[PDB]
Scaffold this motif. Structure first.
Motif, PDB file in Angstrom:
ATOM      1  N   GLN A 179     -40.122  21.568 -26.239  1.00  0.00           N
ATOM      2  CA  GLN A 179     -39.414  21.210 -27.455  1.00  0.00           C
ATOM      3  C   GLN A 179     -37.933  21.500 -27.281  1.00  0.00           C
ATOM      4  O   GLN A 179     -37.555  22.337 -26.458  1.00  0.00           O
ATOM      5  N   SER A 180     -37.100  20.797 -28.040  1.00  0.00           N
ATOM      6  CA  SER A 180     -35.658  20.972 -28.006  1.00  0.00           C
ATOM      7  C   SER A 180     -35.082  20.815 -29.404  1.00  0.00           C
ATOM      8  O   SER A 180     -35.721  20.250 -30.293  1.00  0.00           O
ATOM      9  N   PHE A 181     -33.874  21.330 -29.596  1.00  0.00           N
ATOM     10  CA  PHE A 181     -33.189  21.248 -30.875  1.00  0.00           C
ATOM     11  C   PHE A 181     -31.692  21.332 -30.641  1.00  0.00           C
ATOM     12  O   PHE A 181     -31.237  21.704 -29.559  1.00  0.00           O
ATOM     13  N   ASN A 182     -30.927  20.991 -31.670  1.00  0.00           N
ATOM     14  CA  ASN A 182     -29.484  21.171 -31.626  1.00  0.00           C
ATOM     15  C   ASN A 182     -28.956  21.305 -33.040  1.00  0.00           C
ATOM     16  O   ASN A 182     -29.351  20.546 -33.927  1.00  0.00           O
ATOM     17  N   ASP A 183     -28.066  22.270 -33.240  1.00  0.00           N
ATOM     18  CA  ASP A 183     -27.516  22.519 -34.562  1.00  0.00           C
ATOM     19  C   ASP A 183     -26.778  21.289 -35.062  1.00  0.00           C
ATOM     20  O   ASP A 183     -26.021  20.665 -34.316  1.00  0.00           O
ATOM     21  N   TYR A 184     -27.003  20.935 -36.327  1.00  0.00           N
ATOM     22  CA  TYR A 184     -26.462  19.679 -36.832  1.00  0.00           C
ATOM     23  C   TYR A 184     -24.944  19.695 -36.864  1.00  0.00           C
ATOM     24  O   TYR A 184     -24.301  18.681 -36.572  1.00  0.00           O
ATOM     25  N   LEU A 185     -24.348  20.821 -37.248  1.00  0.00           N
ATOM     26  CA  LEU A 185     -22.893  20.893 -37.235  1.00  0.00           C
ATOM     27  C   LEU A 185     -22.358  20.806 -35.815  1.00  0.00           C
ATOM     28  O   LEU A 185     -21.350  20.136 -35.568  1.00  0.00           O
ATOM     29  N   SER A 186     -23.021  21.465 -34.871  1.00  0.00           N
ATOM     30  CA  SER A 186     -22.643  21.436 -33.462  1.00  0.00           C
ATOM     31  C   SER A 186     -21.166  21.785 -33.292  1.00  0.00           C
ATOM     32  O   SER A 186     -20.349  20.978 -32.857  1.00  0.00           O
ATOM     33  N   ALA A 187     -20.950  23.033 -33.600  1.00  0.00           N
ATOM     34  CA  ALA A 187     -19.633  23.480 -33.632  1.00  0.00           C
ATOM     35  C   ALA A 187     -19.356  24.768 -33.066  1.00  0.00           C
ATOM     36  O   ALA A 187     -20.167  25.348 -32.429  1.00  0.00           O
ATOM     37  N   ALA A 188     -18.181  25.248 -33.359  1.00  0.00           N
ATOM     38  CA  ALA A 188     -17.782  26.469 -32.824  1.00  0.00           C
ATOM     39  C   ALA A 188     -16.743  26.987 -33.669  1.00  0.00           C
ATOM     40  O   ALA A 188     -15.627  27.033 -33.258  1.00  0.00           O
ATOM     41  N   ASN A 189     -17.057  27.457 -34.818  1.00  0.00           N
ATOM     42  CA  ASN A 189     -16.020  27.827 -35.697  1.00  0.00           C
ATOM     43  C   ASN A 189     -15.091  28.913 -35.305  1.00  0.00           C
ATOM     44  O   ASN A 189     -15.535  29.881 -34.798  1.00  0.00           O
ATOM     45  N   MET A 190     -13.801  28.780 -35.556  1.00  0.00           N
ATOM     46  CA  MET A 190     -12.859  29.817 -35.302  1.00  0.00           C
ATOM     47  C   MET A 190     -11.997  29.829 -36.515  1.00  0.00           C
ATOM     48  O   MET A 190     -11.817  28.822 -37.098  1.00  0.00           O
ATOM     49  N   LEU A 191     -11.437  30.945 -36.901  1.00  0.00           N
ATOM     50  CA  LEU A 191     -10.536  31.009 -38.028  1.00  0.00           C
ATOM     51  C   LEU A 191      -9.146  31.594 -37.719  1.00  0.00           C
ATOM     52  O   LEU A 191      -9.067  32.424 -36.869  1.00  0.00           O
ATOM     53  N   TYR A 192      -8.057  31.256 -38.395  1.00  0.00           N
ATOM     54  CA  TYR A 192      -6.730  31.728 -38.052  1.00  0.00           C
ATOM     55  C   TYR A 192      -5.960  32.083 -39.314  1.00  0.00           C
ATOM     56  O   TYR A 192      -5.840  31.254 -40.221  1.00  0.00           O
TER      57      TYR A 192
END
Lengths: 351, 99, 200, 21, 201, 67, 331, 101, 41, 52, 50
Positions: free
Chosen positions: A190-203
């Motif tokens: 089985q496989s999956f991937n996060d829907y947002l598919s991101a990498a949040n960073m804040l500044y």
């Protein structure tokens, strides 16, 4: 016997109703800097307490029945104020009533699992451990139309008992066994991937700041997908990392989590530079081939569209990225492509 | 008839939305893995990035949230009963030291 | 008035408590211990809590599961809002309506006073007594709504109920409650299609 | 008739096609 | 469709001072021994006190009927064909029957359309049946654009228009150099749209 | 401050570290409502467990000792 | 299809797993479960969920109803019928002034109060507790002389308040209000005094039937102002005064409290300090590796937007989505 | 000349408008066991006649603006009362006005 | 296809509220004169 | 008093486009004083009528 | 003397020294509704400069 017409008094109705609605639903939500403290009435010192924002008075003259009369134009002071922190929030209203209407409320709720790795995982036979942590922070798990610091007020939450429920499809034993055997090969994994598919960073951005620089060291950009950005009020995104973060003295919407962003019209320009020399779209693609000019205020070469102050390049980029529209004439995208969070549905020109 | 002289102001609102700058040659969504993400100029050798946002002034302190859209995949494997082993990955901004 | 037997506008559909099905006076139909309370369906739970309740209302999880399965095949892969087309007007999920409220606990309140309609004065002095007539009486503070907001909120108990109008509770005669076809599999076994039976 | 008669009229207007072809 | 007004209960205005018609009264104490005796109060209690006898003075208004009547008037009655309205008195009115001033200073009696027209009936008025219905201030399509340009008289503007000719609205223009001249119209009455049809020219 | 007309943020900014008490220095609050001093306060250098409730006054122990 | 779908052996549908380990904390809560999957079935984790129950205290500042609840129709400046001490300039003489109504129209007034009615032949008198109820009043619009009038008015002891929003809990089943403090064995006797009045014209009536024209029943109630606040207090000083008579009220701002949409934040997500664990019990190595860069809540929000319409409400997952009224954001 | 402010009278608007909605749209549909017979006015003995359903009066105090404030609730008395036999029925309104008035 | 005549009956009323003097106060009497016993004394 | 070096933090390149550096009272063509960039009255377009 | 500020308490107080603003006979009468007069001094007064 009466002589002459009957004694009577007059009152405008529709104007009065309009004034009532306007005052109640806007004038009370102005930024606090426009309101002033009352006279001869003791008020709370802490500005985040419900009492302070309740006994603080705002003059009706700021927003009367004749504000921007005849014009469809949001007020200046309010377009930075969170609009979801409003007692007319339909979803918030529904949830608050669903819990009840009293101060003291027992609850019996069901919480789903959102982590993408196991969200739709098809667990096979075996004995598996399953443990999760739950917050008791009122400011975090509750929402308040006013955003007041609940724990200062005295809101509290206590857990009695928590149980886990799981539904098994009564699959026939033979087919279930065959499926179990077939799902344990090295291939049928089985496989999956996060829907947002991101990498949040804040500044962080200081107060009254105009420019915000950013750098990433010599990364390897393989299979990179794209950018996505917005702006949040620091008084609100909460410090996710630890547990109780003492400092989250606000309880309204959480645009970092709820997905209800509202500060997206404050951006002006974006510049992208690789190796400090090349500009990424800089094959002379855009009209301004070095920046993503979002809104140019003063400039009047004739680049803004939609009878608003968004530049043609930025509008084209948004439309292309959201609906692949822009190389064959603009037109309203179908409802099936313009979801609730899509760009077009929330684009509101004003004048 | 006695209207005063006029000025014009124009602005816009866009809530519940994230500004998007897809990393593609023509900005179109031609696939999950954009063509520009497969270029040898980017898929092979290292690079470093500098960005710059110019934003309106606000009295409250605020934060910019940039969300480098990246692939993020999990593969779940199960050799025997009661055995779960997963293999995570987040390709552009890879996470995890190895050995 | 509307004739629910004809119009389809059923409205007394939320009063059922439990339905017990028994074949040949010995066998309960969902008999392979499928449900949480396998002997009989529990539509709405009365004042009783041991875990079984869903959607922040007084419907048991088994009954909600059965309705959702019978109407949309949703339920073996997590509940979610069904598609618009499946959820027609005379359907289940459209008319589901969970409610809740709070009232004064007449026992665990130190100063309860059951005040009837004949002696509760609110908006006193500005409305007619017990009839839509001219205003009468004097202004006065009031006495009826017992508050449940602020520092003086009285102790409270919670009441939960639900409404499901213009719909039919459904109990498919299928081995897993799911709609696999017009002719359900359990309807053609060589146990219900060969020999006689009787139902209670 | 308590309102601004704005979105109310546009909502009255929403009695037309939407989802597909 | 005049479904009527749900004005079952009466609605009352009130004095903002709680009560008005007060009567100045003096406290009186029961006497001693004499059952029917009564002596005025000597202990400290101000002998002049305002008290109201009976219900409080108030005035009535049917709100829910007034709202409906105002809506009916402002949205139908002013739009009746001009042959029904009569010119006012002692007021200098314009002469051109298309000038906005004529359409604004013409007075139409409310009795033509009041709360009781076709009570309980779903029925458009015969007069308004032929009158253009889009020439109306409630035209959402008109109102949107009118506010989009702005609420002022003097409006600087910036617009984009499409090309609509069927033969070239979708032509896939192959490489080359082409001339693309096109005309435009300056007539006010044709490029501007009014809610009343008054002759902008 | 003679109206310093310099760009409000010219230096490079660093991504906000995600943990408690580093996002901003504001008068905080406990879980149950006790006020909390700002992050950069001196009095937060050490730790204050401050477990207030001692065991219940052992007057019963005194009576048991007497008996 | 007939065969190879559903098992015939006794198999359950929903399984309820009791927590094995649980730990409370001043700000968190940890639950642990031993998920056991049968040897001949497959469980789709999507159907799993954590069922919780407990006590939630919304706190004093939760007012979900905009506007007031008590005497809403009353004018926002109308004072409650009250008496108060006042400096007297006639001849620290503190005379009291009275302001109040008298809607009830009785038959006769004696030293026992107004005569509500007759019983047999004996005249009957109103109860001190409640009988001159504030609600019941004269029911004829055209004025008619009333020679005997009754009504209720608060004593000076009770603080003065605007009629808008003022409320005092009842004490006796007949709907009265009134502090029931008594200093005796039966320490619950109501202390309701009757105050008598006549026309200021009636001065030289010694021996003449100077009949009291209006009798007022004085009370002392536990007045409260739950959801309203004063918007104008004319004088800073406390107590009761003629100056304070003009104070005006105003409903407190509405304030809703509920859980986050989709129960956001209730579970610990994307914080490696408190990370959920799922692992085969034979080993113990957690199979859920979560970072602080990933944002699961927002991702699930956007996913739900992508799949289903984000306007229908599903009460189970508390799926109501935040949204502002468009006529408020844009005027 | 006037000394001081102008004479005026006060009336709460939205609260009064809600009373009506509630009253005229719910309070008249409570089951008959709550409504009480009028005074000094005749009424049909048959409890199904329109005259019985009209002449019978119901106190406004049962359902005023302050009932279950803030709670998304349905009145208990109205849970079993038919909700389609109501003058706000859109389908019934349309079908009645289609024939005429 | 059906054609005919129906009588909705005296108890038909599709509009809430009244038809006549709707704005008038609900207690306001029409200008009327009546007879009563007189105590002329 | 202060006693710290003026610029310890790293310094980024100046963005080239207009209105980034030196927030002062600028001036449009032909007089017309123009407020500095970080003034709140410059978040929206401001077009006039007759260009006189 | 300014149009909007006046006695606060509805409680009658029989002011002994009162003030207000009135239009001279030079200005045409008109009704309140709609009446507008552009300001002249920054303090908000209407006035007429000669």
């Amino acid at each position: 016997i009466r002589v002459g017409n009957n004694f009577a008094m007059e009152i405008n109705l529709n104007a009065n109703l309009w004034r009532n609605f306007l005052y109640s639903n806007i004038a009370l939500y102005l930024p606090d800097k426009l309101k002033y403290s009352p006279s001869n009435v003791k008020i709370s010192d802490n500005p985040n307490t419900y009492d302070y924002m309740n006994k603080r008075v705002v003059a009706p003259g700021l927003v009367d029945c004749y504000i921007n009369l005849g014009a469809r134009w949001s007020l200046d002071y309010m377009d930075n104020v969170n609009p979801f922190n409003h007692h007319r929030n339909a979803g918030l209203r529904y949830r608050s009533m669903l819990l009840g209407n009293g101060r003291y409320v027992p609850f019996h709720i069901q919480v789903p699992q959102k982590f993408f790795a196991i969200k739709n995982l098809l667990l096979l036979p075996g004995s598996y451990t399953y443990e999760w942590n739950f917050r008791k922070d009122v400011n975090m798990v509750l929402q308040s139309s006013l955003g007041n610091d609940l724990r200062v007020d005295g809101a509290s939450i206590k857990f009695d008992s928590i149980c886990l429920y799981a539904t098994f499809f009564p699959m026939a034993h033979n087919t279930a066994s065959t499926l179990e055997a077939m799902l344990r090969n090295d291939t049928n994994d089985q496989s999956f991937n996060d829907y947002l598919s991101a990498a949040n960073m804040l500044y962080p951005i200081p107060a009254n700041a105009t420019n915000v620089p950013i750098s990433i060291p010599s990364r390897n950009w393989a299979a990179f997908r794209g950018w996505a950005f917005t702006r949040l009020k620091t008084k609100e995104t909460p410090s996710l990392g630890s547990g109780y973060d003492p400092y989250y003295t606000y309880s309204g919407s959480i645009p970092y989590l709820d997905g209800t962003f509202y500060l997206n019209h404050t951006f002006k320009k974006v510049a992208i530079t690789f190796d400090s020399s090349v500009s990424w779209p800089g094959n002379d693609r855009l009209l301004t081939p070095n920046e993503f000019e979002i809104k140019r205020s003063v400039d009047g070469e004739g680049y803004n569209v939609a009878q608003c102050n968004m530049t043609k390049d930025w509008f084209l980029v948004q439309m292309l990225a959201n609906y692949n529209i822009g190389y064959q004439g603009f037109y309203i995208p179908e409802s099936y492509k313009d979801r609730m969070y899509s760009f077009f549905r929330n684009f509101q020109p004003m004048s | 008839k006695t209207a005063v002289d006029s000025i014009t102001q124009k602005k816009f609102l866009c809530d519940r939305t994230l500004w998007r700058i897809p990393f593609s040659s023509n900005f179109m969504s031609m696939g999950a893995l954009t063509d520009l993400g497969q270029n040898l100029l980017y898929a092979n050798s290292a690079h470093a990035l500098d960005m710059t946002f110019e934003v309106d002034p606000m009295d409250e302190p605020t934060l910019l949230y940039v969300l480098f859209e990246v692939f993020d995949v999990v593969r779940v494997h199960r050799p025997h009963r009661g055995v779960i082993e997963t293999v995570y990955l987040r390709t552009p901004f890879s996470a995890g030291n190895a050995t | 008035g509307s004739i629910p037997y004809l119009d389809g506008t059923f409205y007394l559909n939320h009063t059922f408590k439990k339905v017990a099905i028994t074949f040949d006076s010995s066998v309960s139909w969902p008999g392979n211990d499928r449900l949480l309370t396998p002997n009989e369906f529990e539509i709405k739970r009365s004042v009783d809590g041991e875990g079984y309740n869903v959607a922040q209302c007084n419907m048991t999880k088994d009954w909600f599961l059965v309705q959702m399965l019978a109407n949309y095949n949703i339920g073996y892969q997590g509940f979610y809002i069904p598609e618009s087309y499946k959820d027609r007007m005379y359907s289940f999920f459209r008319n589901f309506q969970p409610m809740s409220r709070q009232v004064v606990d007449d026992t665990k309140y130190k100063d309860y006073q059951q005040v009837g309609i004949l002696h509760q004065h609110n908006n006193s002095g500005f409305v007619g007594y017990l009839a839509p007539t001219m205003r009468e009486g004097q202004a006065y503070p009031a006495n009826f709504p017992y508050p449940l907001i602020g520092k003086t909120a009285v102790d409270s108990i919670t009441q939960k109920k639900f409404l499901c109008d213009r719909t039919l509770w459904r109990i498919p005669f299928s081995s897993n409650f799911m709609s696999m076809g017009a002719l359900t599999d359990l309807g053609q076994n060589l146990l219900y299609a060969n020999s006689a039976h009787a139902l209670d | 008739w308590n309102s601004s008669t704005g979105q109310m009229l546009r909502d009255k207007l929403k009695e037309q096609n939407f989802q597909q072809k | 469709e005049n479904h009527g007004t749900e004005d079952e209960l009466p609605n009352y205005c009130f004095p903002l001072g709680g009560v008005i018609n007060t009567e100045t009264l003096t406290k009186v104490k029961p006497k001693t021994g004499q059952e029917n005796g009564w002596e005025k109060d000597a202990t400290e209690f101000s002998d002049k006190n305002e008290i109201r006898v009976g219900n409080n003075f108030a005035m009535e208004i049917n709100l829910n009927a007034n709202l409906w009547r105002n809506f009916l008037y402002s949205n139908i009655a002013l739009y009746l064909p001009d042959k029904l309205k009569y010119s006012p008195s002692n007021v200098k009115i314009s002469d051109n029957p298309n000038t906005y001033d004529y359409m604004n200073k013409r007075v139409v009696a409310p009795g033509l359309v009041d709360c009781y027209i076709n009570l309980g009936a779903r029925w458009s008025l015969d007069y308004m049946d032929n009158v253009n219905p889009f020439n109306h201030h409630r035209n959402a399509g008109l109102r949107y654009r009118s506010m989009l340009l702005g609420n002022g008289r003097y409006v600087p503007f910036h617009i984009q228009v499409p090309q609509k000719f069927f033969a070239i609205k979708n032509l896939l223009l192959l490489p080359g150099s082409y001339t693309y001249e096109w005309n435009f119209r300056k007539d006010v009455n044709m490029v501007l749209q009014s809610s009343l049809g008054n002759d902008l020219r | 401050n003679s109206f310093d007309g310099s760009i409000v943020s010219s230096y490079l900014t660093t991504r906000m570290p995600p943990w408690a008490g580093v996002r901003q220095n504001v008068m905080g609050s406990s879980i149950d409502g006790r006020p909390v001093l700002p992050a950069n306060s001196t009095t937060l250098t050490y730790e204050t467990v401050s477990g207030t409730p001692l065991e219940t006054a052992a007057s019963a122990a005194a009576s048991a000792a007497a008996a | 299809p007939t065969h190879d779908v559903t098992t015939d052996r006794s198999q359950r549908l929903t399984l309820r797993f009791i927590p094995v380990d649980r730990e409370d904390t001043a700000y968190s809560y940890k639950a642990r479960f031993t998920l056991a999957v049968g040897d001949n079935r497959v469980l789709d984790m999507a159907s799993t969920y954590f069922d919780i129950r407990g006590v939630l205290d919304r706190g004093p500042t939760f007012k979900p109803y905009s506007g007031t609840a008590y005497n809403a129709l009353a004018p926002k400046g109308a004072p409650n019928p009250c008496e108060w001490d006042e400096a007297a300039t006639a001849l620290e003489q503190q005379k009291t002034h009275v302001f109040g109504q008298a809607p009830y129209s009785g038959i006769n007034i004696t030293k026992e109060g107004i005569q509500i009615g007759v019983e047999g032949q004996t005249p009957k008198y109103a109860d001190k507790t409640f009988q001159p109820e504030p609600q019941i009043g004269e029911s004829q619009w055209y004025e008619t002389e009333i020679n005997h009038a009754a009504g209720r008015v608060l004593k000076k002891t009770t603080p003065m308040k605007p009629c808008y929003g003022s409320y005092a809990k009842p004490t006796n089943e007949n709907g009265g209000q009134g502090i029931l403090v008594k200093q005796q064995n039966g320490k619950l006797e109501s202390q309701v005094e009757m105050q008598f009045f006549s026309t200021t014209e009636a001065t030289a009536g010694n021996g003449d039937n100077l009949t009291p024209k209006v009798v007022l029943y004085s009370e002392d109630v536990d007045i409260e102002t739950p959801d309203t606040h004063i918007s104008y207090m004319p004088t800073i000083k406390e107590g009761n005064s003629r100056e304070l008579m003009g104070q005006q009220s105003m409903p407190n701002r509405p304030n809703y409290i509920a859980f986050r949409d989709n129960f956001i934040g209730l579970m610990y997500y994307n914080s490696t300090g408190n990370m959920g664990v799922l692992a085969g019990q034979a080993s113990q190595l957690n199979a859920v590796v979560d970072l602080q860069d990933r944002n699961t809540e927002l991702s699930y929000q956007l996913l739900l937007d992508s799949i289903g319409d984000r306007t229908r409400y599903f009460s189970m997952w508390n799926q109501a989505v935040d949204s502002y009224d468009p006529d408020v954001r844009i005027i």
